[PDB]
Specification:
The complex is a heterohexamer, with three copies of chain A (137 residues) and three copies of chain B.
Chain A (H helix, E strand, L loop, with lengths): L3 E10 L7 E11 L3 E4 L2 E4 L3 E11 L5 E9 L4 E10 L9 E11 L4 E6 L14 E6 L1
Antiparallel strand pairs in A: 1-2, 1-10, 2-9, 3-4, 4-9, 5-8, 5-10, 6-7, 6-9
Chain B lengths: L16
Classes of the chains: A mainly beta (137), B little secondary structure (16).
Function (chains A, C, D): Cytokine that binds to TNFRSF13B/TACI and to TNFRSF17/BCMA. Plays a role in the regulation of tumor cell growth. May be involved in monocyte/macrophage-mediated immunological processes.
Family (chains A, C, D): Belongs to the tumor necrosis factor family.
Main location (chains A, C, D): secreted
Chain lengths: 137, 16, 137, 137, 13, 13
């Protein structure tokens, strides 16, 4: 039966002197042991084809927000998918969720990350606003 | 508001 | 193998004195017996893990549109995910679909609702504009 | 084990004197033999139920963009789902991705198409910006 | 556009 | 931004 995982934000992080914001995740649903949450990053234990889905909810007025979902493994990297949202100029209208997902061969030893390509991006910690999840197929 | 209903309230979108 | 359900809109609904617009759903694809579309909601019969997905196509010009997908059961409510779309202020540009999805544990006797948090919300009855679907994993 | 296919853009194609733009595809992940890409279309071979997903990344400034995912078979067109993105008027902000997905019964011999209803639509060739995928359930 | 008959939606025409 | 080499997209640069 399918290993699965659904994750929600515990905390947000964006180290000084870089233009990236990451999310620290915590599991709310779990089946199997082929994946594991580890602070800001999710480790893959079982090689295999996974459905990977990510939503982040933004409020910045700056041009164009979104996320980059990636895998990293054996000194390597591969951007799996991005989600791009244009935000409007008026701060009260400036709310958008950005959902993207896809099916990827993920390898044992891979760290999966979700990065917002801006420093200190204003994004929701709400469990039903920003999330990340896995289904082994 | 509208998103500020208590059943699905998200502080992120309730003014400022 | 996997039980599934794909529903499309037969009819919009919105009670006076509320700021909610719901949708009346009819199935277009059904396999298995787990889920049953009862007018404006979907009743869960077989407990298990489910991929849920919702799209809505909006034409309002007001600030921000979207949907709330919820399970209500055992005197409890839990919001599963939100889709949030900022709509522009030109009527002849003010068209956007909003899509979100996720994996969640649904228990027998639960009820699934899809609410748009506005009264008299302008949204599409086109079965390929606005839809709601399920996969048991 | 589940059949899967995940396709990325090699080429963008738009026959002049028509209001349509299409993508020539190439797989970057395959399992099973139920589906084959043939340039701008994808031919079904095994009848069954499929999760279909599609994202297109746009940069046009014209009102409202999106895509139409269709199956065509036995002299019948059927439109499965659409994604609609309103675009803003400032070129520097006019970037948006559009993601929709749904579960559908696909028959052997069916031709699957993804079309953008503008001539010469500007959309990304990035494999993690614009893509299309299938999972047999 | 979105009013092509192949995928027409009254909602936007 | 979106032109970081780790996920560069010529489309937006």
């Amino acid at each position: 039966k399918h290993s699965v995982l659904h994750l929600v934000p515990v905390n947000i992080t964006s180290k000084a002197d870089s233009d990236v914001t990451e999310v620290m995740w915590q599991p709310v649903l779990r089946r199997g042991r082929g994946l594991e949450a580890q602070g800001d990053i999710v480790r893959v234990w079982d090689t295999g084809i996974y459905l990977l889905y990510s939503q982040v909810l933004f409020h910045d007025v700056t041009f164009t927000m979104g996320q980059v979902v990636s895998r990293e493994g054996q000194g390597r990297r591969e951007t799996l998918f991005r989600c791009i949202r244009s935000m409007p100029s008026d701060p009260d209208r400036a709310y958008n969720s950005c959902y993207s997902a896809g099916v990827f061969h993920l390898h044992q030893g891979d760290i999966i990350t979700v990065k917002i390509p801006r420093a200190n991006a204003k994004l929701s910690l709400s469990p039903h606003g920003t999330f990340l999840g896995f289904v082994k197929l | 508001s509208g998103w500020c209903d208590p059943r699905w309230y998200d502080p992120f979108m309730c003014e400022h």
